Amino acid sequence: DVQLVESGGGLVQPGGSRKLSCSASGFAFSSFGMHWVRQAPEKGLEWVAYISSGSGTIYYADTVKGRFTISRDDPKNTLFLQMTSLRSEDTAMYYCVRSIYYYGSSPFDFWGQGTTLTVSSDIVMTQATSSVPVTPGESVSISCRSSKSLLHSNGNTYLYWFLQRPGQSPQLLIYRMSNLASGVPDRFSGSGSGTAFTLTISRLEAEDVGVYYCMQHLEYPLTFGAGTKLEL
Amino acid sequence: TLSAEDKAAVERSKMIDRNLREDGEKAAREVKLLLLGAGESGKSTIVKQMTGIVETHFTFKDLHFKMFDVGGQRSERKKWIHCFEGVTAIIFCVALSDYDNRMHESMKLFDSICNNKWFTDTSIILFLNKKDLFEEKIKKSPLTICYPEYAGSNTYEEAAAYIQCQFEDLNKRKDTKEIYTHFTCATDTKNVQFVFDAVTDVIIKNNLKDCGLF
Amino acid sequence: ASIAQARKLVEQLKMEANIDRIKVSKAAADLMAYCEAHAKEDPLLTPVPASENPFR
Amino acid sequence: KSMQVPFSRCCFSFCEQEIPLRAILCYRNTSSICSNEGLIFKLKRGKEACALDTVGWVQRHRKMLRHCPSDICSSPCDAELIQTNGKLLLAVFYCLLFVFSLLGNSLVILVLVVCKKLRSITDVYLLNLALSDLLFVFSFPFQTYYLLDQWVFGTVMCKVVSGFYYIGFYSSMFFITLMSVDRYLAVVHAVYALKVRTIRMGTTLCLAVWLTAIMATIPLLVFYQVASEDGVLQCYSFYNQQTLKWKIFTNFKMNILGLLIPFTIFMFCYIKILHQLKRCQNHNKTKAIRLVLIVVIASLLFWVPFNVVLFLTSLHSMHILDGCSISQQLTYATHVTEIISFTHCCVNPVIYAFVGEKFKKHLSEI
Amino acid sequence: ELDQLRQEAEQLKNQIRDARKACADATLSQITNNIDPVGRIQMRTRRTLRGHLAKIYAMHWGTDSRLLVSASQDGKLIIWDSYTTNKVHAIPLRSSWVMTCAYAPSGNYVACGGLDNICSIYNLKTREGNVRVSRELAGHTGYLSCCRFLDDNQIVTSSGDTTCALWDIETGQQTTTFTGHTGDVMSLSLAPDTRLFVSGACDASAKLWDVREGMCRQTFTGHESDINAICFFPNGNAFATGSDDATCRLFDLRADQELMTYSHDNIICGITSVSFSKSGRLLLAGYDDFNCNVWDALKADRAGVLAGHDNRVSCLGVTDDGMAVATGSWDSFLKIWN
Ligand SMILES: *[C@@H]1O[C@H](CO)[C@@H](O)[C@H](O)[C@H]1NC(C)=O
């Protein structure tokens, strides 16, 4: 089965350097582009860097440009994030995300467990609600809004919905705001008009509690919203 | 005017393009040979020397051949023979001992293959198996039973030369394709050496045509 | 020898004899009716304008 | 009057009389290109005199005489003597050859692009050779005007036309060499040639050819300038008025880098191919022998004479050869061998494309 | 005794042909004499899908009318995005001798086959992200000439045997075997409902098969040579065949007879593939001569020519939405016309 395991995290003096390594197995690692996504303690996801399949195109967040370097090497099925001049606000648990781009594909489908790092001694996506209480059985809807219309001319919209259960890596629920990701129960569904988007869950089994995030893929840098928490 | 995912898809398409180009370059390395011939074991001995298609890959003297055997296809040839239009050459195996006749049907097959429209300029590598068994039969019974018009002695060499002439003269287009012949009972490296030489000559011809010298 | 395929083919012919088949005129009229009815939603017949043509 | 021969008025003889002091007597410097230096006096009797000892009495006179735009022994010597009829013949040859080469190379490029789709490495070399020939022949109408009339297109166009001329020359040289190497590789080393003859290799080698041709041309590109020598505008290497040194450098550079190494490889490759075909005589590949002989003979015919006459002009410029007769004959020989080399642009399609049966089929198809 | 069997075989044939002659009260050329001519059909090469380095023997559209699979004897089965000329996938086949290809209606799987006798099934959508062979269906003794998916689990294939077969992809056995032909089966068209399928063979006959009982419903004859191609009219109650004689024929199931012959004096070469427009008013046919002729299916007049190919147009395909027609030829290009 597909498995991504990150390593190299730990306690690092601010101003230091460290390399995160992502060991991949169970899939054709060379075919996939890869992403790094931080999650600072009690904070939403935040995209870091992107390495395309074949290492052709590179992208970085403006908050990591220059300091970080994303790289890979297909023969040993490993991804790397070299990190230099670590400032204080880089304390986060880094996710190694897999992503394949072709017609009808499902980018960001699989996320690694993630490695914690503690440094110590643009389209804006918005989610109004948080800490929403829900008893199981009925349906709920979560809303995410974008400053720029995510509907591209070619006719496919680029909002991605992810679910992060507590103490576990996030998983792709919806890609391009309509398509249910593989292995996701049918109760999850996505809808919306090109600037405001919603994901609705019909029946809320207790297993699906957690934080739901929305991400735009129209153009880099990819931006997550502050996820909406659903709790029992 | 392209989304991020569209640019990534274009990058993937370019990667597939370069992979296909490399695969095509590697494929051009190969020498394609089509194996044909009557007899249930005449071509089996040759395959040993080196249903449906069975491919016997082998590299000889740094040259990588790819020999495809169609003996298992009990279907109309003209529907799938054109698949081997670009085949580098055709090995045609015939047993000299089949002059009891089966040899005449082998001649018919050779006529239908050599003069085929698709194989207008694909040289034929003719193999005459079983020259020892042919020696036994020819000192047992005469070749006249096969070729009534034969007007030569009972000796092995004369019979072999006559059979070679009868098979070669079926080639109606001598100005475009050649028939390389070999008596293939040597059961040693001489068979692979001969097919290598014929293939080298065919490659030299194809390069001369491509360069415009022929 | 040939008894087997002989019985098989004569039974084939007998079965194919028992077919309820219609006049050619009405079948041809039905085919014409289908050709004409679905004409408007056939892009190959009418050159579709580039406004909604996915191929430029 | 050409890329290789400017209209220079020279002095190859000396008069020792030191006081021809009374006439219109207005002086001139010899052309910069000319090897013997000296000064020219124009007398009121019409006779012009030579002062090859540019200094001494004549410098005193120079500050006692004046310059002029437009018994004493010997006259200044014109580098060219071709009359109007000769220039007319050269001009019509240039024009007809320009149009023939233009149509031939255009036809080759057209059919090779649209009908062959560049499916062979040989096609890649042939296409780039055709492009080189087109670039070369683009200088011909400028040559016709420059031969029959002075240069009026200015310094920038002079540099651009010299660039066309020399890039075409060098690229054609290296592409015919590459075709010879490819044929040797694909005839004498077929088994190994399968592993190295691919479209990518041909493309890489042809970009190498273009880059090295550019590298050879930049010095000549910068040297060339337009100058009002002897009352005539001339496009030639006048940069810094060191035209003699630049002429020597251009002659030897073209000689070496166009003939010596290119034709060395070319003859070695085709000699080995001919030996191979002589080895295959049991199959009687006579036609290939005839075509390789035709290509070799044609290449030598329209390249060797031009290069040797350039080498002889270089010897003259280095004072190895001296006199009017040699100089005028060398200018004439340069003007005719340049024509014959220009024939390469229209003959290369002939010997490389239409003689090949791979190519006539698609020509007849169109 | 065999003579008597031949005797009542002959009299049954006589009776069947007598009934068929009785049914032939008219033809399309009569009742369709009044309809408007379709006129010249000018089609341009909107796309030129490139990347194959050898002959393209089969292509098949996807139900989405955008993704199309194409098989070539370079050893590749490329899944193309028609709109952007992008290559979604490039499956390397185990055996390069491929002369058929299928794209599952669900789009999850593709199939291919040829002289190997094996209908390979390739799973496009996998967790690993690469296309992987899911099941190799073996059992035919002759080259696979055509293959069409019925579901993700079932597939019907035609072989160089005298037989077709319906296979269970999950278990790999032949669910059903269709035996009636007397020559090589070269093409296979699946009805829109998939209940029935037609198969044209080198015995110059096209046979109609019922999938769930392995029994030949009908036999259609009239071609002078082997039938290379076959395709249903969008009704599913009629189909058109092309053969090495320069004619296409339109057979109708309910009338159990030949309706129309698409022939011309100029054409003296075989038909490699055939297809119908969405409405069925246009019949597309690829030819050995380096062209695809567009025929007015009701009037038999040639409506146009798709002349932009340098070799035999081996395969044709018309999208379900009928927005474009894809022609694949031996020159290794795959053109989309509209
Ligand atoms: C010509 O000779 C004179 C001699 O004084 C010299 O000053 C001048 O620079 C030379 N060149 C030209 C173009 O006048």
Residue numbers in the entry:
A (entry chain E): 4 to 124, 128 to 238
B (entry chain B): 4 to 53, 182 to 231, 241 to 354
C (entry chain D): 7 to 62
D (entry chain A): 24 to 93, 115 to 410
E (entry chain C): 3 to 340
How did the manuscript describe this experimental structure?
The C-C motif chemokine receptor 8 (CCR8) is a class A G protein-coupled receptor (GPCR) that is highly enriched and selectively expressed on intratumoral regulatory T (Treg) cells, which act as suppressors of anti-tumor effector T cell responses. CCR8 is part of the ten-member C-C motif chemokine receptor (CCR) subfamily of chemokine receptors. We then determine the structures of the fragment–antigen binding region of mAb1 (Fab1) bound to CCR8 and of the CCL1-CCR8-Gi signaling complex to provide key molecular insights into mAb1-mediated inhibition and CCL1-mediated activation of CCR8, thereby expanding our understanding of this pharmaceutical target. Here, our structural characterization of CCR8 bound to either an antagonist antibody or its endogenous agonist CCL1 revealed distinct chemokine-receptor engagement and activation features and rationalized how distinct antibody binding modes can inhibit CCR8 function.
